[PDB]
Symmetry: D2
Subunit: 252 residues, 4 copies
């Protein structure tokens, strides 16, 4: 039994009407008919601390960053979901700042599975739902899906479904009748079908890759110091792949 987790990263608290929620409302029943259990979280309804602290930071400065919040609750849902769908409005040609905080904190997991020697989100599947007034879906898809791929998510074809109006200021999905927009509706159906299939596949046949084994082989064929000479005698910023400055010989 697979679980999809859909994160609506709108900046507006429930029950304020969300343009992005309209795409989510299409995807949820399609996943259920795939036999996939689905949960929708509007992350901005939850207290997720944005500030950062670790042991290299100042202890007292980090007090707020270390406080109790709802991130462990959300992180556990992400860890248990086989399909993660970020459902984000577009803001500044990016995902929202709320999606941004979530991904920042998700990228703090410095663990390795057991057992498999894989990053903890390996064998999961990502899709995207995006809503903008005019522009930015493909740019946001590239950025978010690239980052989720680094975490261990696989991405099927046609995994990013979205609504946009024409060049202009709006209006959004609701006044623009996005729920009857053919292109968006077909993309959502593509996404659900492809993410569902890939998730079933990877649940049966997960990656067997041993990342520690890959890294040990890489260590045997690599140096543990990076060093290059720099031409400090020019204002030029033009790229020069060959500069013939000589190699750097490092101590001991």
């Amino acid at each position: 039994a697979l679980k999809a987790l859909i994160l609506n990263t709108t900046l507006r608290r429930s029950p304020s009407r969300s343009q992005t929620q309209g795409l989510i409302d299409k995807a949820v029943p399609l996943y259920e008919k795939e036999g996939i259990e689905t949960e929708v979280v509007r992350v901005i309804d939850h207290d997720i601390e944005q500030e950062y602290w670790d042991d290299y930071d100042d202890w007292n400065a980090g007090e707020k960053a270390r406080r109790e919040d709802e991130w462990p609750w959300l992180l556990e849902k992400i860890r248990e979901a086989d399909i993660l769908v970020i459902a984000t409005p577009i803001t500044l040609n990016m995902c929202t700042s709320a999606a941004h905080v979530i991904l920042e904190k998700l990228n703090l997991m410095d663990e390795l599975n057991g057992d498999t020697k894989q990053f903890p989100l390996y064998n999961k599947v990502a899709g995207l739902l995006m809503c903008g007034n005019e522009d930015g879906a493909h740019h946001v898809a590239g950025t978010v899906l690239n980052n989720l791929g680094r975490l261990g998510y696989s991405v099927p074809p046609n995994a990013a479904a979205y609504w946009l109006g024409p060049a202009g200021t709006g209006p959004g999905y609701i006044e623009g009748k996005g729920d009857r927009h053919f292109h968006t509706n077909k993309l959502i159906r593509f996404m659900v079908a492809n993410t569902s299939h890939l998730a079933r596949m990877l649940q049966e046949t997960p990656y067997t890759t041993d990342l520690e084994a890959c890294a040990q082989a890489a260590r045997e064929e690599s140096d543990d110091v990076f060093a290059i000479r720099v031409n400090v005698n020019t204002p030029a910023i033009r790229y020069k792949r060959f500069q013939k400055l000589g190699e750097v010989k490092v101590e001991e």
Copy 2:
């Protein structure tokens, strides 16, 4: 028996030394040990016409665009390869212009399989090898992999492997000793192992998605006209998702 096709999109003809080729030289024997037959094409060595023509263009203007070239030969290799690896230098925070032409022409296939009702590059797998002097790998990964995902490629985790120096003008992979660069070497191993596994998986268990069926369902729940009113009384470009201008009623 699976085939990987690696496209070196350097701007320099063979046998000029390519910085990017160094990453390719790591990946090729790793794929062979996976039991995967690999071919490397340096696309700039081949005559691929950049100009565009179709029936809406002017006939005589399109003569050069319609000429005989090596694109059918390259396209057939792409169609038969189960794994496509774009191996691109970074240029202007983008892939090279040679990669750009290839992807432009690849995006002209307006066909649907048989049979499966899928885009013709469905069930294939993409990875990336990238080389830059300082910056741009993740940006290029997002853009290229998003576009290949729209064509039907699936992307495993950690599918983009790359080399970059620090902020500066260079030098590149060769003078910078990228062949002994631990991070690049481990990323290449991650990519080969994950793309190989996903390609074997999809060869055994391809997507069953029927895109025509998805589109017919989308047609039943959608309009065949998009129409919104525009506020023509303001210089503002600030986004307004609600503008309360009223719906547009369309003829017949």
Copy 3:
């Protein structure tokens, strides 16, 4: 007398050591020698509410979004600064989420000057300081500077200065000795000199553009409805600039 405002958008509260602060520490005395008064704000030290509310949202949901915070104080500094420098670490190939919130709220100003009929941040100048462990400076520069340009900032050449290490996980500017990194140091000097000159220029000779006049002329040559027919009979997502579906005739 011109003012530069430099916003350090690190996620860590003062006095935690910030890698990005090192670039700021170079820029501040260079601006002073230009005769420019400079202020550094670490925005995460201040209470800036992320949630959104306006009159189309639910009143009670918006209570937290409407609360008293430090945004008016920060916004007034931005309005009075002739040079805005966003000094951002790189996170997820983007600016930080803290920079993201600031820009989101900055993009909510729906006002027009007086008087000049220009957006309120017209005639100001933007630069960027960026710090990453390996990659993303140019991508972030494009996204942030494009967005600030839409708000009214002008951008001189070589306005984005940054530090990055090579492909890898780190370390950052401090352990990587970025303060003695020639390329970063020269870029910072370029940025300060060019932003200072452009700000002095625009203070003496501001844009005279009348955006209302531009919009009224655009209204006279434009429609107040956007409408196109859609081909609802295909799964294809391939772009077709000509589809010969016929024009849409709109009521009255």
Copy 4:
């Protein structure tokens, strides 16, 4: 007397109808009324060699890259134009491959003015005209304008004007009636007015920045070697700005 040069980077030869040309047709008379002499070049009509050669490449391989073509003619127009407007369709969420080749070759100028000690395209002004069927204008604006800023162009506010339809496959500007699209028409007017003003300003009051002087000061405060230790004992790719590996001591 100032000159604007507008480069239509469509992939289709004249006289094939270009969607992007429609935006150019709006901008050209607006520049003339500003008293600015304007020239439109459709770059794909001209023979511009894409392959690269320099002295580090193989001599015989580089023969085609070194051949006589129309690039010197185009480069001289770029050097003499005070305003450069790239007018590009959107392809793969990027500018076209033809724009890409032009910018690649433009980025090969490794010269410094005289005299001013500035990059040769200093004191010029850039704007953008973009046309897409649905999505990508802001992403392309960020990438292209960032790159032109590195070359010496200044960018005024609201310098990128564009047309896009809603999410979908098309049609383009012509069938979509982009010539009567209010938002695009007002953005073009903004761009012309702001680029014209900034170009007049910089012709009267150019940057006085001495980039050689900036670089010499940067040399005095910097090292001529970049060197960091690498942790070769982990598969992790999570970013760690502090790794406490110790500094690298370099020979002599």
